[PDB]
Design a protein around this ligand. Structure first.
Ligand code: CA
Ligand code: CA
Ligand code: CA
Ligand code: CA
Ligand code: MN
Ligand code: MN
Ligand code: MN
Ligand code: MN
Lengths: 232, 232, 232, 232
């Protein structure tokens, strides 16, 4: 099999294994801060530099993967805690959409919420323009921030949140488990065919954004990942 | 929400939180050895002592859970490395079946391979009587050791294996991710309705067994668990 | 390390982790009401259902523990605001004393004020028979409601009180910090050798009582707990 | 009674309620980073600007206090994770010792490890000149870094550690409870006569230091405090 695995206990902005896009900044404690606090419509994205072959057009096999990460979102005075973080998967040439409005597009889609990526959002602001649930929520997005499926959640300012993700290739099921700060766990699962939605080679990463009047601290603290593709 | 959570980084004799059934022994290093290498048809089981309420007849909700543990199986001179470990979920009254032959029943089934439980097995011996695949394998068992779904695998003597299971209550999906010592991961997923196969209160634990001639070391090294039921 | 920890932000009817004894009620809000307002000499107690092993007889170790909870007492028309709440530790077989008069026994002692427990009381009525100080008070009780030590305090009808307690195994010091409504803190500390007054396995919980004439609302709103026993 | 109370969820540089001394800096996420990873004998300290009256001259009364704070220490590549953090109480005119060597003096003592203060350390490096135990430990310092009493502990890089301190005036008892990332708790308590060791008015705070070769990220994330002095 073809296995790809890495693990970041802390990041740095001079590492060739990480692509930075937008307002991304690495702090002295090793955390990655995706948005710029005093910047209007800020957008920041981080991507594992190396593309991962998630499927083969030769065999027809699709990879299974397991990945976990921890983030922190914190309020800043006089600003609406918005807009959220999104763990996404996209073609290897992915870029911040041209003329991005940041805000509720999460840095992955255009104005009407479309784009080419599959992902899991931790949305903290309800945009009715994207059919947002009326509360903080966790959602499964397939080429659009108009979530295929959402689950009410609760973002607690200043808390370290841990996430564990499993995609089983045979059932093509993507399931998510969020351990909150009060101990409670939140899960959400959805069947997504990666082969049909994405190309053979892709890039995984995180993206956060905000608007004018809607901003908050978006930090990524750690990240480990392992994918395995059977070559037979 | 109703949450149950715990974490064992080692075990000790006399902790009211754990129930021991059969040939279980607590090693001086904090590990739990499931079977007796000197007994024929050995069976050892360990359970979280408190029943967990997995679904409510009042509301109709089903809990979601995330649990992870790691184990090790090691070969012993002269005996066939058999038969394996199984993480299971059973009614509150659960006990080692009456006339257990151990062996391929894994300590949770009768002689024909039937019982009342839902569980994940790590089978190191192929029993044609239970329709086992020809190689070591990981399997999803619903009231039978004749697995509803299996996936090839390879037990390595002395290797520590780490496992992650996520049960998403809404899709009723149970997913597993196994991390071999070599780095490659193994996954298997299956929709299993817990509300349909089990009582409101259940118990969680691990079971292992052997035969005459089929024997090996079965160790549980750690276990963490968290379940959350959306209360009324 | 052998650790037990739990967190109840709210309570629910039917949870396997909570034992109710006497006049206990779970309100629609998740709060627990310890006494019945229409009953003479009412008593209600709520306990963490699992026995916790506080000291080991193998090694000579006693566990340290940190617990916090919040309660509220509130006046009811025409009745004297009595008698108070008590957070206690008792042998795992603990039960409301046979033919209990409620009142100043706080539901944990007998008519003479004796019993088998260690506890911190939030006493709202002065019982000269148990040598109560003349004002409301916080007391440390060792097998009796005639406190080993008390400190004046003031109960505010409808106020949410927060309490933190730390037991340090090495010195044997039980420390209590009470945070009133007006922000003021009240403290009390006492050396109590738990290994000499209690059995290895105990249960933790809250008890409240009233009499004819003496009645008020007794609520438990939350409770978190963590104990760690050095096993080695 | 005279009560002083505050609660910080994040700190800012333009805050006159806090005194910054030494290499201290405030990150964009609101954390206080006590040391400079680039400086050789970095020393950083942060003090609550307002002096607290811990005891009275008229009445021999001492104050009781309850305080809780969280921190995070993390390793940096090519440097020994040293030297630790210390919560301390000292004269209102306190300043970093002249010609401070950082290191094992924790920024509160001179070269022989002497000074005027009373504190709780989370020492991550073993200095024999100050008779340090051989492992990571928590200690009670009374005018010296050669602890009056210590307890073994473990500092986990990247982990958020919460602490709770209660000082009870009547028993003159200081006790601490540390919650590792693990769920496990460590406690330590000691009888310190605050009126015999410190002046009427004092300042509360934290300090951290490093050496050449010994350096790590030392952060303070939050801090709440309350103290009450009976003036009768
Ligand atoms: Ca949105
Ligand atoms: Ca078998
Ligand atoms: Ca009384
Ligand atoms: Ca030191
Ligand atoms: Mn959304
Ligand atoms: Mn099988
Ligand atoms: Mn009393
Ligand atoms: Mn020291």
């Amino acid at each position: 099999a073809e296995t790809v695995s890495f693990n970041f206990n802390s990041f740095s902005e001079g590492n060739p294994a990480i692509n930075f896009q937008g307002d991304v900044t690495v702090l002295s404690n090793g955390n990655i801060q995706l948005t710029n606090l005093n910047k209007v419509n800020s957008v920041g994205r981080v991507l594992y530099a190396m593309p991962v072959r998630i499927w083969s057009s030769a065999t027809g096999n699709v990879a299974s993967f397991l990945t976990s990460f921890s983030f922190e979102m914190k309020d800043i005075k006089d600003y609406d805690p918005a807009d959220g973080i999104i763990f996404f998967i996209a073609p290897e040439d992915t870029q911040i959409p041209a003329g991005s409005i940041g805000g509720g597009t999460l840095g992955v889609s255009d104005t009407k919420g479309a784009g080419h990526f599959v992902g899991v959002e931790f949305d903290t602001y309800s945009n009715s323009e994207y059919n947002d649930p009326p509360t903080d929520h966790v959602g499964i997005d397939v080429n659009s921030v108009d979530s295929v499926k959402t689950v009410p959640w609760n973002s607690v300012s200043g808390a370290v949140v841990k996430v564990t993700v499993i995609y089983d290739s045979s059932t093509k099921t993507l399931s998510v488990a969020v351990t909150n700060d009060n101990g409670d766990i939140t899960t959400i699962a959805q069947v997504v065919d990666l082969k049909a939605k994405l190309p053979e080679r892709v890039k995984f990463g995180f993206s956060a954004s905000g608007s004018l009047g809607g901003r908050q601290i978006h930090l990524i603290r750690s990240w480990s990942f392992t994918s395995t593709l059977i070559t037979t």
